[PDB]
């Protein structure tokens, strides 16, 4: 069966935080951060608004867009690098506060590429037949875990949600191909540090894997639909920097402008990255049904993870 | 198609702790301990050894007894709510400490009822015609959060872990029938408080949730499987505490014989407990391929599951 996304919806924080935010407690530029980033401001949540606040704002608007009931949901899968605690999970949250009927939910940790990697978990569970609409969340509050004395993290980070609601849609449209990976090996690279609290990156390593891992992977995904470049209406990367993005956007071999480019707004907001960017694109009137759009990321893992869709209820 | 169980592990941590261990920093007794869980002892890991030092056991044994080669993995879909961080994880661990492919591979979160949700996961992706072997992992290493000042819980909680590999098993063999719950009006009944970074449980809430809920979705997967608990050979539920697990059985009205029972050597040992006890079953002669076992679990969360499923290759 043809499953696909029949309801979508983003959410980013109301407190934006400039780069001339920095300069106060890091070497850090308007001029530097752009030029090195291709970022001009992020989202950054309150205090007293967590990883699940994010979730339950994109969740809601995805919910309507789809034109369901909260009732229909069958089943709720967050992915997010954040959550409030390990337990209970956003999802456990989302059950209760969106009031949903007690199906399950449950938080899959794959960073950066966690949304794609849920949004096919859900695929695989609606073409059983037993799961019709299944909420998929990609959430993340980095600002809580990221180190203001690094500035090439500080500076980088932002939160923000996306949602959308998996099911079966319209023939022609939906999930057409897509790629999961892991690479444990460059954990080092990029994780948590167990003591501190806080994240960990060695630039210049994650910078050289991210490259070529959202170029192939790309390629990859495109091939397997049997896509040409002429069928891709829009190429949507996981916004971790520009340069990073140009150089992927560049390897595939794609249009300059058929990008979509939001880490100028919102920075890099890991599994809530692809989401908050296709919600500009649709309310840009940039995004419409039949498109077909090439999804791709990467996050702390290492993970990846690359789709091709055609929008479409 | 039949996608069941066709390799199994177990492991715990070799340092085991004797209820009268607590009584040099807490008002306790091996008989008080008995009396209230029927623990009489547990396993710790180490100071250096984490959730994945102890998912990486399980799944050297599940992948052997399997009978294929790391390679052969097609996915590593880990469960546990105590993974060593939250990125890279623990899954994106064994990818490599396992020599296995770059193959997808992510952390469920779930509590203690994550292992049955992720082997549905897995039968899911099965159910696809892509995946083949997926190596499915319930690990946890509770005593890193529970909270020693709080006899309440310092004594119920223990560490180890379990692990499977998912395919397509012979003879009409498996998964026969599942039921994955979720309902968040109980996180606050157990959760993981932020500041402190302690379990924290409200033990009669979850006392009557567990008994309940085991009972009740016990039957309902039975039911699903028409079945009578005559067919069941054996009544596998979270070893959350002698005294839940009984009314449960007496609940389901199953035979007091055929109920496993580990708890006594492990404690609570979350995502950890059911493979555990599955493990006890098999090497005492108690579980044999074709027999129709039942597993049941609760977490914090609230979340919930049951499986029928006939054992075997």
């Not at 049904?289 to 789709?307: H, K, P, Q, Y």
Request: glycine fraction near 10%.
């Amino acid at each position: 069966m043809n499953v696909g996304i029949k309801g979508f919806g983003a959410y980013a924080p109301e407190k934006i935080i400039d780069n001339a935010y920095f300069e106060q407690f890091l070497d850090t530029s308007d001029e530097w951060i752009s030029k090195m980033t291709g970022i001009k401001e992020r989202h950054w949540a309150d205090d007293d608004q967590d990883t699940s606040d994010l979730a339950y704002e994109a969740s809601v608007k995805a919910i309507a867009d789809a034109g369901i009931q909260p009732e229909d949901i069958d089943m709720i899968i967050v992915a997010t690098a954040t959550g409030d605690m390990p337990f209970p999970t956003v999802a456990n949250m989302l059950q209760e506060r969106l009031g949903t009927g007690k199906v399950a939910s449950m938080d899959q940790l794959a960073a950066c590429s966690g949304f794609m990697y849920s949004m096919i978990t859900a695929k695989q569970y609606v073409q059983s037949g037993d799961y019709h609409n299944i909420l998929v969340v990609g959430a993340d509050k980095l600002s809580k875990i990221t180190d203001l004395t690094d500035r090439s993290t500080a500076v980088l980070f932002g939160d923000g949600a996306g949602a959308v609601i998996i099911g079966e849609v319209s023939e022609g449209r939906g999930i057409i191909s897509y790629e999961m990976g892991s690479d444990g090996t460059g954990g080092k690279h990029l994780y948590l540090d167990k003591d501190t609290g806080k994240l960990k990156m060695n630039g210049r390593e994650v910078f050289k894997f991210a490259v070529r891992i959202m170029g192939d992977a790309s390629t990859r995904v495109v091939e397997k639909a049997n896509l040409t470049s002429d069928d891709i209406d829009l190429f949507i990367p996981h916004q971790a920097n520009i340069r990073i993005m140009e150089s992927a956007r560049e390897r595939l071999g794609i249009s300059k402008d058929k990008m979509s480019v939001s880490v100028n707004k919102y920075g890099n907001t890991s599994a809530a990255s692809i989401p908050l960017s296709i919600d500009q694109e649709l309310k840009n009137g940039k995004l419409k049904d039949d498109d077909t759009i090439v999804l791709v990321g990467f996050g702390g893992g290492l993970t990846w993870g690359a789709m091709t869709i055609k929008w479409g209820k």
